[PDB]
């Protein structure tokens, strides 16, 4: 971390194998942002010209490396995780005859006057070796190191700069080598025996191709409103006028979670770990209410044969709230486990138990043979081979009628049968979800209630973003939610305090860029549509505004219009013919002022 | 003589504050751009 400099129009590389000619290609990839900070390494950083060691640097979604050098002091890079021989690492070294790239379980030994030596003498369980002409060969020796989709992609470019240590020009890096490694590369280190390190981020760039297959210019679409305009129009020259290029939103600063302060835990233990189980034709239905629906207990009780949810994901049950948790507990033959599901056809679906097709819930099966499989077996079993008609969803027929044939069979299973016949205990949890009207909710840590700010909120399972304020609406004790003329939620009742809160949407609007034209000036003004200038200034100070660029926004260049807040133009009392329209009587123009 | 000038944030109407939806929306190509230009052209026409 010796020093920091700014990259200037540098680190662009060819994103793909496609040749393009005289086109402007708008693409999204991992790039070094323009004018971003790069760490300048003061030879060897912490290390001196010839010292024992140097620190390891982060490898955050790819690294840009550059160094103008004639002595070839930098002769390699190491990529890896722990770099202590417990995890495989990637070593790229140049001996000025060939470049050797290897992946092995390497031990770092502080490998680097008047001395040269071999490095990384401990190299166990080697799995990959590659040899090629040297990477390195006034010369910038620019490289981009990216590791995506298994492959470690290395790009490079060499330039002849005599008068500058960090050139101010533009060039694109060409792909050099692309290796199928499949290694994590959380962190990396440069091997010496001066250099700049930047990091890549997801970005969209407009790349200008020449008549030949080469990139001659590029614009970073997120650097400045002028670049965003250029990307929107896909041109490097912008004509005079006002353009709509993006939208702005105010992001939430904090998240709040509010659920009823219920400490009763749901009796999943008694239902799953039951002494006795229901027969096949007559499932035992219980109801779970006014409790915390903590589902980690099911995983704590037993490894499962199957845990398949249809209307919900098994991971997310501890985030959701439920209105009707019902638990149907029964024991079936293993070969029937796959048949208890929505939309299935067979003897169990039709004669013993049917599920609805619009089913929200989970079916959990666990082999119970350790308890239920005996030579005499468990005589709780009562399968129904024949039923006069198909069973309706959630219907249960306790009474047994003899067909004018004895439909019900009570047979225990021996431990010697194939597992498809051995009993499994199955619990079906029915989860009706009706937009957060109820007290059953998975375990979550409640937070404080934050008003008059743009926040994320979770109210009894209702998830959203907005500004919460004191409500003046007169809800009846029964009513919990309010909606406007368009069925958009605009009010909630706090589950712990029963306070009525109004939800106002967080500020949002269009962004227009007022450009004199790039043949006159690169100065632009930005209009935030439909917003107060106070709200915009607060969003800038709080780092909440979605677009990452900022307009200088100094005193007397912020003007409130009916169209919106105009930042980057000085309002004057001298009228003129309209040039670039803004709206509601207000126009903007590029003029000579005061001198 | 004139019509109310409207503007629609296509992504925020279809995929309001949802990254997953926005990424799925990208597979339909430039429909949001065509709608945005059509509404901008209408907005300009009303002032004309």
């Amino acid at each position: 971390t010796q020093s920091y400099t700014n990259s200037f129009t540098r680190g662009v590389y060819y994103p793909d194998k496609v040749f393009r000619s005289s086109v402007l290609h708008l693409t999204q990839d991992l790039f070094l942002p323009f004018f971003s900070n790069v760490t300048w390494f003061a030879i060897s950083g912490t290390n001196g010209t010839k010292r024992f060691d140097n620190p390891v640097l982060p490898f955050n979604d790819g690294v840009y490396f550059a160094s103008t050098e004639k002595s070839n002091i930098i002769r390699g890079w190491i990529f890896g995780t722990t770099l202590d021989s417990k995890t495989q690492s990637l070593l790229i070294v140049n001996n000025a005859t060939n470049v050797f790239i290897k992946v092995c379980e390497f031990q770092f030994c502080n490998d680097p006057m008047e001395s040269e030596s071999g490095v990384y003498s401990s190299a166990n369980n080697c799995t990959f070796e590659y040899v090629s002409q040297p990477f390195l060969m006034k010369n910038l020796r620019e490289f981009v190191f990216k590791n995506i989709d298994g492959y470690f992609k290395i790009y490079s470019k060499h330039t002849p700069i005599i008068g500058r240590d960090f050139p101010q020009g533009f060039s694109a890096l060409e792909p050099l080598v692309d290796l199928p490694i499949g290694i994590n590369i959380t962190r990396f280190q440069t091997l010496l025996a001066d250099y700049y390190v930047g990091y890549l981020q997801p970005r969209t760039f407009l790349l200008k191709y020449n008549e030949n297959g080469t990139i001659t210019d590029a614009v970073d679409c997120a650097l400045d409103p002028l670049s965003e305009t250029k990307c929107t129009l896909k041109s490097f020259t912008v004509e005079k006028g006002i353009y709509q290029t993006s939208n702005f939103r105010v992001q939430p600063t904090e998240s709040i979670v509010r659920f009823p302060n219920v400490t009763n835990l749901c009796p999943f233990h008694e239902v799953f770990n039951a002494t006795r189980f229901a027969s096949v034709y007559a499932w035992n239905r219980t109801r779970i209410s006014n409790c915390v629906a903590d589902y980690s207990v099911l995983y704590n009780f037993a490894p499962f044969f199957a845990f398949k949810c249809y209307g919900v994901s098994p991971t997310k049950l501890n985030d959701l709230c439920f209105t009707n948790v019902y638990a149907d507990s029964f024991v079936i033959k293993g070969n029937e486990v796959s048949q208890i599901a929505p939309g299935q056809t067979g003897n169990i679906a039709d004669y013993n138990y049917k599920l609805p097709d619009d089913f929200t819930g989970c079916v959990i099966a666990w082999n119970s043979n350790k308890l239920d499989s005996k030579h005499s077996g468990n005589y709780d079993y009562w399968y129904r081979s024949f039923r006069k008609s198909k069973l309706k969803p959630f219907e249960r027929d306790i009474s047994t009628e003899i067909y004018q044939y004895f439909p019900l069979q009570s047979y225990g299973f021996r431990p010697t049968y194939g597992v498809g016949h051995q009993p499994y205990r199955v619990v079906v949890l029915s989860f009706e979800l009706l937009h957060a009207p109820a007290t059953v909710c998975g375990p979550k840590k409640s937070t404080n209630l934050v008003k008059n700010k743009c926040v994320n909120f979770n109210f009894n399972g209702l998830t959203g973003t907005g500004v919460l304020t004191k409500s003046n609406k007169k809800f009846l004790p029964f009513q919990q939610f309010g909606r406007d003329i368009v069925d958009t939620t605009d009010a909630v009742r706090d589950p712990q305090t029963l306070e009525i809160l109004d939800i106002t949407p967080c500020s949002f609007g269009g962004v227009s860029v007022i450009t004199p034209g790039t043949n006159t000036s690169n100065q632009v003004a930005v209009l935030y549509q439909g917003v107060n200038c106070t709200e915009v200034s607060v969003a800038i100070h709080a780092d909440q505004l979605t677009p990452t660029w900022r307009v200088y926004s100094t005193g007397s260049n912020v003007f409130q219009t009916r169209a919106g807040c105009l930042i980057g133009a000085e309002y004057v009392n001298n009228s003129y013919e309209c040039d670039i329209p803004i709206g509601a009587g207000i126009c903007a123009s590029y003029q000579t002022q005061t001198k | 003589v004139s019509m109310t000038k409207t503007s629609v944030d296509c992504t925020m109407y279809i995929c309001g504050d949802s990254t997953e939806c926005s990424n799925l929306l990208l597979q339909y190509g430039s429909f949001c751009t065509q709608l945005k230009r059509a509404l901008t052209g209408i907005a300009v026409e009303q002032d004309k």
Partner: peptide, 27 residues
């Protein structure tokens, strides 16, 4: 006879003001 907070229809739908105000049209 004929009848900046986006109180209604806050679903990505906005209304832009006209370039000429009612006063300018009256002028």
């Amino acid at each position: 006879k004929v009848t900046l907070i986006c109180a209604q229809k806050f679903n990505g739908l906005t209304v832009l003001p006209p370039l000429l105000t009612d006063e300018m049209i009256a002028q």
